[PDB]
Every structure is written in structure tokens, then in C-alpha cells.
Amino acid sequence: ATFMTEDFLLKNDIARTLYHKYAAPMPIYDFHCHLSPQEIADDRRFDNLGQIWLEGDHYKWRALRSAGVDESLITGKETSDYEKYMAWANTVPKTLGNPLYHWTHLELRRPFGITGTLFGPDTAESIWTQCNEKLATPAFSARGIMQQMNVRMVGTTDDPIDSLEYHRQIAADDSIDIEVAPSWRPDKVFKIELDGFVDYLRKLEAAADVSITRFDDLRQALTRRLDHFAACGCRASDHGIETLRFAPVPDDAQLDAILGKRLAGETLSELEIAQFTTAVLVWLGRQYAARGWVMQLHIGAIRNNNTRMFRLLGPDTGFDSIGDNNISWALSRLLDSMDVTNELPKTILYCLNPRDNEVLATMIGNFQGPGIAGKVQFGSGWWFNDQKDGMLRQLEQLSQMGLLSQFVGMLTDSRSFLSYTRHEYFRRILCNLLGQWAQDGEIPDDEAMLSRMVQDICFNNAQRYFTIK
Amino acid sequence: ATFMTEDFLLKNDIARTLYHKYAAPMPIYDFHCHLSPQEIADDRRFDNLGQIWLEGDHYKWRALRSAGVDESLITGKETSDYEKYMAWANTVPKTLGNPLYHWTHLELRRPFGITGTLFGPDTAESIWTQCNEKLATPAFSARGIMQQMNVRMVGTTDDPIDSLEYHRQIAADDSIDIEVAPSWRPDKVFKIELDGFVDYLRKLEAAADVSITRFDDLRQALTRRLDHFAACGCRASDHGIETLRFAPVPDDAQLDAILGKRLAGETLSELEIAQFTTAVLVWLGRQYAARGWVMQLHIGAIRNNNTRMFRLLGPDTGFDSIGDNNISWALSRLLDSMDVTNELPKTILYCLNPRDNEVLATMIGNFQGPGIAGKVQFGSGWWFNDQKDGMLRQLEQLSQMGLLSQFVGMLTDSRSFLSYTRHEYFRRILCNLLGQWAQDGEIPDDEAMLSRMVQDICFNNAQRYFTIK
Amino acid sequence: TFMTEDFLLKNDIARTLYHKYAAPMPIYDFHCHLSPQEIADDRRFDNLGQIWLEGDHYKWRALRSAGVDESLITGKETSDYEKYMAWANTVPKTLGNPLYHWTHLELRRPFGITGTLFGPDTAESIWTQCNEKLATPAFSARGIMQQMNVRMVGTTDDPIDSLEYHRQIAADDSIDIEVAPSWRPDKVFKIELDGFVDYLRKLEAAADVSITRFDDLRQALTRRLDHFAACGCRASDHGIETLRFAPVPDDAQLDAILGKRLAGETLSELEIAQFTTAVLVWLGRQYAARGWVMQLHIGAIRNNNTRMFRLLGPDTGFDSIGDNNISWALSRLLDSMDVTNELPKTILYCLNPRDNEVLATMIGNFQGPGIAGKVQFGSGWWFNDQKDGMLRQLEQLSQMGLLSQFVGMLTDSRSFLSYTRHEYFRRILCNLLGQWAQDGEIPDDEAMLSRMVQDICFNNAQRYFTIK
């Protein structure tokens, strides 16, 4: 009868208590996101609701396209923000069942305080005006929203060649107590088979002041950049792996020969690509272990599927989807290559194809370590899987194959300042899961035990895990 | 507790209202099936219940074999319809949990009007006699059943070499107002690696009255057959793909060489097979786009697994199952090859292996288009997946990754006139899903919005989607 | 309340099915890894830690995940009580993990401990109580088997084994539980493994046959199969991590391959597939001729941690779920035996649940007459042997096959405390059937439902494993 009350997704008494008493009030340790550091440093003020909300994480764009809306009303420079907004307002009523319908109303509730009203053509104009007035105030600036949402720390995703000037600016600014840490994402460095590898390498050379012609030079350059990240507060790395490969690491003469061919423009064989890629990832893994950083592996996307649209809009514009390569063998050999010398760092594994949930949940158990709780983690439902069904399936496998109690938990993985309600969504789902289990007599209804678990999964595990020990 | 009441599968009050008030009265647009056009044209009168029930869809055959029944009582020319029917009667009580138990009772209920009776040895005799008396009347002929089940349109699956004479006969016959459209299924044309390719190509030559030596001759022959299909009311195509391949389309000289080699009995390399198959599929896709037809891709079957039985019974006799090749890369390249020139048609994708559900639900989002609600669709649970669990999983991924509101819906994919209860089954499941979401406060409990959605998924979406723009 | 007698039973029909029909049925643990010598000598356990800690390596994996030092897990240096306390400190961290259910299920049966959560505050008392019980005859290896109403077990043995403890148990009137050996010839067909030559020499000595050509291997295996037959065997098992297939070549090629292996030469993928397929097809025909059940356990990725393998060896908790594509090879392998109508009774198991539907539909391609479900889709295996895993396997079997003919549950365990896994399964099954009945999805007919419960809990397996 009532849509999205304050007990949204809470279907039993234990769930309501867990959520309202132990989960909801915990701060957010958003260890992995795609927020713009300059927007945080400059404390961006948004002109209107379309501007802060529309692009989001390209889910709206995908929904608009699916609904048949012309691209001019989605990414077009020839239409106003208000027009793009009305197009979205006409589309939301068509999203029932899609998490977009939930996110939209969660986001209008927090931080905008709009409740008891469905977003659509008949309410859009009023919602636009009310939100625009709020957006004109300091509390609703980029920093303001982060503070209202109780954000304690965020980990941005950055490239080795970045200056991290905005991170330093934020660190040096006492008017903001939220920690904004950069994260090392060297994708371009290990994907030697991609067309832009050489161009990127030249940028790395200038960034590190190293002439890169031998593999060892690459190690030198990467060490310099790793040192820069360290100095700017980096505690984690990330790796977007679309094609997970593995080949035992050959000697430097062979790695030099591979780099040489690539620089000359010669086609590399799969073996050579696997060899180079594995050499870099293993060397990087050892560095992360030595520095006490968390290594994140985001595996399985298939990107830029639409050539016509890629030519007009470029990457990360809503044309990426789920890949389906076999991965257990390569994953196992890759992790083991680091662990054999006891140089496997704290590691978080994410799979974009949920058919791999059990592979990952069991894979982490092969490489755990002493003195730390859950050294190797199976990450929260990622991207397309960051929704109710997706999260329930991830949580179920982590629970059955590992230890839910030691789960680092949720992260927004978002470039939007309105994404913090994704933590609320996750928390409600987790509390309902635990509540249902307890109510059904599948776990004790000992509130002391459950409250501790909820607090840990919602924040304490993450904060502890990301500490450079 | 009572088995299969009129509220079967409807577990909440909202579900009951949606189903009984809005879903049940909707007509059926069975846009993809395997019904015999000749049986529709001649308005076949079945002699008995065994005949109309046991000539297919092969699910019964598989259940009978699993129960240890001799093949002679399943497909044998030697046993009578009544003896085969009794073997089935003795087996139904062993099928609890299998959708066969549901179909059997749904079908006796509609169209036969038999309720409150479990089918098995004790009741089979009476049921046989009662159904035989009804089968002898016009309301229970092939067309009669379709009329009783409120079928307004059907899309049969036909080969390019087919005359379509029965489709013409039905079109010209004013005593039948149900539209029976043919669907273009050119499997044999693109599966160049199969033994019967050359014999098939000769039949295509005969049907088109075109000599085929070069790849361009194949385009000419196919163009003529496409026009024949268009003139007989075709608005759709279908493609059964067991081995989804991809290789960039080479120039005609290469395609001619591949065809030349094949016609000479020479063995083709995997690259050559991929090139030819891809060239045919891409060209066909473009033709479908230019004509405004829907393109269906049914991917993943592993066929004729039992050689001993294949030699005695041939293909499509219940020895096919779920395959598991990796498909995202080939699928992406194949669709993008059509979409790059903006020549991708309305497309529906189906996967036989549910592990690929999320791959497909997300793949469709990469290629949507303007002016149509859900240009690319993720099809209803197919074949083995056309059951409660399978459909709930397919619906969940479509809901989460796409827009359920634009879903074209259910299709029987059957050769049996008693398959329309599969729509009843789908509708009850859908209504219960929406109802449960509404009741749990996950979607608004707004009868105007929900009923419109139910009606759209039950019929309106398909009617609009299959209309040539 | 946590784990009452109605644990996992959410409706009245389920309660009736479980308490009145499932629970009283005896157990036919047709596949396990129990030590026959422990059964023969009726092993007496010194303490709770001893009988419980190693189990099936699930506890070791949880301990490592919790950050517990390896010396307190597998170290020969620390005591049983220290290891036990480490485990007591870890159990409260396992909510949501089946370990929490097993722990408490095992304490209830056979130990009689109820209404208390296992943790640091209750561990010492539990240790003392359980130890007093372990000191009595009723809690010896055989005693526990009799307490859990175990009627038959199928051990997992290697072709070169003597099976002397099987012959001893059979000759002993004090024990009426049947303990049959099962033939697991993994080392024979996995030619690519380093230890293949050394193993072959053990087979040569066991069968007293000089193995130089492929036909010699047939003779050697035939003698061993006969030995196993004379010792009561009626089932086989095959652990297949890399499911291969290549058409079986003639003996000249098979001889050449075997020759290259014995001479230390490296084999190609085709060569390995040829040899492996020829051995599996030959064995399959043998199983068919003898009326034995053929089990295929597919999809493990083993010994993933080199550093730990070097210190502890295999089966120490460092194996996980593989993910190779298997439908094509599985189909051609089964078809290679079925083409001459020589496919035996077969149970298929997949370690990766994404393959549930592949297996559930694959079995339907090779069913046979005069038998109820010749080819079976096995219960959730290993990692999948838990509530979610079992429910998913049951659902696919039900949707694509015939649940009524399911051979049912097996522990696949080396622990005498594993019989509660049967209890767990039975509760889950009864609740599933009960929920369907209550929702009007199946008839609420006690006669039909009870029959089905008893068949799945014991009758189906007893008939299925009968050689006839």
C-alpha cells in the first residue's frame, strides 16, 4: 500500500531495529568512487537539478535511450538542462522494477527532503524549483552534500600520470575534515595491446622523467609515480581488467623484446601480451604489498560496444556491458604468483558477471593471511550488479563461502554527489537479510552479535582494512 | 491445501486484482511459435487426446525416458495412441516439481474445462473419453482452440524455401480473423559448416529460381525469398545459433572463395566459417532493418547429443540441451557490425543458458534507438527456461538492467495447440511479481499505473513492436 | 528461536513430512571419504578437538579467513585444546556460513548439547562434556554410525588398494553396517600429472602386470576391477578438474602416447585428451557391463596456493571452484559410451553452480529404459552442499528432470560427525515440498508426498545402487 516509507525494504521487526538503530547512523567510508577531485576542492555549486543529477553514472542515459528518447535530449549540446530534465521526468514512470526508480526517490528524500510524492511529468516542475533553491545554498554544494550524507572518507580513482594537485589542496584545507584519498589505477600501463599504449607511455615518461625503452625503466618510472601517490595519501589501487590473462613471467630480455616490438608497432602474440601484462601486475602487486595498500581487481567488463556512438561520445558514456571470459585459472595463477613469495597484498576481488560469484567467493579462501581479518575480500555487487538482486546474490555467496562478519562492505563507485543513498540502499538490504535469517531461526537473534556485525560491515571493517598497517 | 485454484500462483491481493481484472482478459499476440501452418489452414480436427498432446513439444518424451519407459511407448510407430497416452498417465504422478505437472493441469482446465481432478492412472480413462468428445467439435479444432484462448495473432517459424501457400490460404479465408504471419528462419543458409549445406543451397536455388555460385548470387536469391515472405505478411525473422561466431566481413572475392571451396567439398577453416556466417548474418540484419522487421536471435543450444537415438529418430526429438560457449564478444561484434551504419533492426535476444541472463540484459542497453520503446529486447525465458524459476530469473534481470514496462512479453515457442496456457502461466507469474513488489512497498500501489503496465506486457507492447514503422 | 527441532521447517506440511517420514529413514551414504581402517578398528577419539577440527577443511579455511596463525590450525606443535580454543574464538564470526549450522547440528546429534551457542564463554564446558561422551563405546567411530542410523556407506578407494579393511568389516559379525568400496581411478587417466609414472609402477605391482602398451593397462585395470568386484564394489567415482575430449584413436596411437609419457617426453593437449578419453570410455564400458554406478565430479581447481602446498600438501583447504566450459566435452564423453549402448548408471556433479542447468538438461539426453533415472544430477557438491546450493540444485533438477527419482544426499566427508549433513538436507527438502504444497503448487496429499520423501531419503539410492 505505501511506497518507500522509512521502513523501505525492511520486512521484519529485527530488520527495522538493525537498520534504524545500528546501520543508518554509521558514517560512510566510500573507499572507491569516481568523484571529480577538482569539484571537491573547489566546492562546486550546481546551477540546477539536471546539472547535478542527469549524467549520474550513465544509468539514466541508458534508460532514456531504451525508452526511445532522442540523444539530443540526453547528451546533446543543443538542448537545455531543463529539457533534458523533462525528458527524464517523462521517463521515470517507465522505470518501475529498475533500481533507477528507487534511486530517484531515495535521492529526492536525501538530501533534498522531498517525500510522499512520485517523480513524473505532473511533479517535475515543482521538484525542479524546490531543488534549485536548495542547490543555491552552501549546505547543498559538493562538500555540503558530502557532509549532510555523513561521509567520512572517499577514495577517488586516479591515473599514475595525474598531478593530484586537488588532493593536496583538499588535504591542506582545514575547512574540510573529510579525507579525500587518491587511488592508483594503472590500467593503461598494463594493457599493452591497446592502440593508445605508446601515447600513454610517452605521457608516463614525461610524468616520471624516465626514458622508457627497457622493462626495468618501466619499473623505475612506476616507482616514482607510486611514490608520488604515497606522498598524496594513497592507500589503494584499482585495476579494470576486461581480458584477464596469465603467462609465467619471463626474464627481462624477453620483456625488453616485447616492449621493443610494441614500440616499433609490431603485432604482439597472445603469449607476449600475457607475459608483459602479468609481469607488470605481479611487480605492481609486490609494491602494493610492500606499501600496505589494498589491491582492487575489477574484472569482466566488455567496453565500447557501440562504434557509431563511441565515435560521437567516447568512452564511459553508457555503452559498456558484461563480459563472459573464463577466469578462475588466470586469476588463481596471478594471485599465486604474488603469494608464493608472501607478497600478496590485501586484495579485493570484484566480478562484473554474477555467474562468477561462487568462483570469487571460493577463490579468496585460497589466499587468506594471518594477523588480519579477511585479507582477501569478495567485493560488493559491482556496477550492473549494484542493485537488490545483485547484492543479495553477492551477499549470499560471501556468506556461504566466506565470512560475512569480516566484509569491508559497500562503496558507491560513482561520479555523482547524489550517490550516497546507494549506501542507504545497501544497508536496508543487509539489515533485511540478517533480520529475515534471525526471524526464521537460521541465526541467533542475539542483538549484541547482530549490532556488532552491522556496525562492522557498514563502516568499521572498511576503515580498519584500509589503514596502512 | 488446494492444488491449482483460480488464484494459482497469486499470493497477494494486488496480484489477484492485476491478474483477474487486467491480465486474464487480454488477447494473445503469440509472435513466435512452431505451429503447422497447414494444420491452421485445414483447421485440423484431432482424433484423440493422445494425438494432440503427445505429438510434441518433446518435454513429455524426455520425462517418459527419464522414468524408464520404453521408447516404443514414446515415439514408436508400433504402439497405439491410447497405449502411449496410458504410459503418460502412469508417468505424470512422478513429475511433481516439474512444470509438466502444471502444464498438464492448466491444459485440462483450459480449454477442456476439467478441474478438481489430478491426472494419473485412476482418472486417465474418463479424461480421455471426455476430451475426445470435445475434440470432435469445431470449438476444439486447431482454429477453435486458438479462438477459445483469445489468440489474435501468431508468428510461425518458416524456412526461406517454403512456399507459404497455407499462409496465403489463411489470409484469403474470411472465416478466420486470426492473423497468421510467417517468420523468416534462415539457419540453413548461414550454417555453412553443416553437411546438408549444399543440398539446401540447391533447394534455395529452386525456390528463388536463381543460380548460386558467388556470394552476390546468394544475396539475389535471398532478396527474392525475402520479398516473397514480405508479400505473405512476414514482419519477423529468427535465427537458431548453436555456435555464435564472429570475424570481420571480408570482401566479396574472399566470400566467393569460401563458397567455392564449400561447393567443391573442401574443408573450411574456422576463420572461413566465421567470415561466411558473419557476412550472411550482417547482410540479413541490414535487410531486416530496411524492411522494419524484428530480428530474433536464439543462442546456446547443444543439439543431437545422443548419436544412437539420432540415427533412429533424427533431429528435434528431445536429445538437445543447454550449451555453454562464451558469447559476449561475438554477440557484441555481430550487433555492432549492423549498428555501425545505423542498420541494426529491432532485435530480440534469447539465451538458452541462464548463466548468460545478465550478459544479455546488459548487452541490449548498448544498442537502443530513438522513436521506439525498447528497440532491443531481452526475450522471455526460452525453452528449458520457460518455467517459473527460469521466468522469474529472466524477469528479474530484465527489470534490473532494462525496462520491464517495454517488455514485448511471452510467446509459446510451441508446436502444440494446447500451449496457450503457457501465457496463462506467464501472466500469473508476472502479476504475482508486480503484486508482491507493490505490497512490499517497492513500487507504487497505483492501480492505473500497474494495470497499464500489465496490459502493455501482456499484449500492447508486442502489437506495437511488431508493427512495421 | 535458533535451531529448534523445527529448524528450517517453515510450515506445517514440512513439519509433518520431516518429523513423521524423513527423520526416521535410515542413511545410505553412498559416497564418502571415511577411513575404512578407522571403521574396522572402531576408532576411539581422545577429544572433541581431534574428531572435529580437521573435518573436511572447512574449519581451516574459516580460521585462516579470520586471521588465525597456521600453527593453531595445522601445526604439529600446538595442542588439540589450543586449536579448539582458536576455533571457539572463531565460531562467533561465522554467522551466515554453514559452519555455524554444522557446529550446532553436530553438538545436538550425537552429543545431546542444545540451547547454547558455541563460543569462548561455553567452549570449556562443551569440551569436558563431549570428552566424557567420546570416552564411551557409543561414541566410537562405529557407535556414532549406529546412533545416526547409518545402514550402508560407500568409501572412496584407489585401484591399487588392498581393501583389507573392507574384507575385515565384512567378516565381522559385531558390525551389520555395510561398508562397500568405490573405485576412484583418477591417477590412471590423468596422464599429464607428474606422479603418473610412479603411480603406474604401483599398479604394475598391484595387478602384477608389466604395463608397456595400452592393452596392458586394460589387463591391469581388469584384474583390479575384479578385485574390487569380489570385495563388494558397485560404484565408481572420477574427479575431473579439466574435462577433455578427443575421439579415441587406435591402439598404435595410444601405445605411442603412453610411450612418450614413460620416456619423460611432454605430451600435447590432443595426446592427453586422447589417452584420457580412451581410459574413461574403456572404464565406462566396464562399469556398464558390471552394473556399477559411474560418478563424475567435475570442476575443481586444486592446489592454488603454491607456498602452502609446499608446507602442507594437497587437500588442505586450498582448492576452489573452476570455470571451464564443459557441455561439449561432457556430451561427447557420455555419447562415446552410449553409442554402443554401453553408458552405465551415471551421476553427474558440477562444482560451479553456474553449470546447474547444463547438467540438469544434459542428463535428459541419455536416459534409459527399465530404470528410474539412469542418469542423475547429484546433490549440491562440496561448496554447494549448503542451504542456497542445495535449493538451487533441487530447483534445477525439479524443473528439468524428475525430483521423485532423485537418489538424494551423500556426505562426501571424512568425518564421523558428518551425518547431520543428511539431517540438514532432509529438512531443506521437506520444507521445499511443504512450501509448494501450502502454496497450491503441488497436491497436499500425504500419501504422495510421504512416498516421495522416503524415496529421496533412502529408497531411490538403495534401488539405484543395486547391481541388477
Ligand SMILES: [Cl-]
Ligand atoms: Cl545515472
Ligand SMILES: [Cl-]
Ligand atoms: Cl510436451
Ligand SMILES: [Cl-]
Ligand atoms: Cl571442517
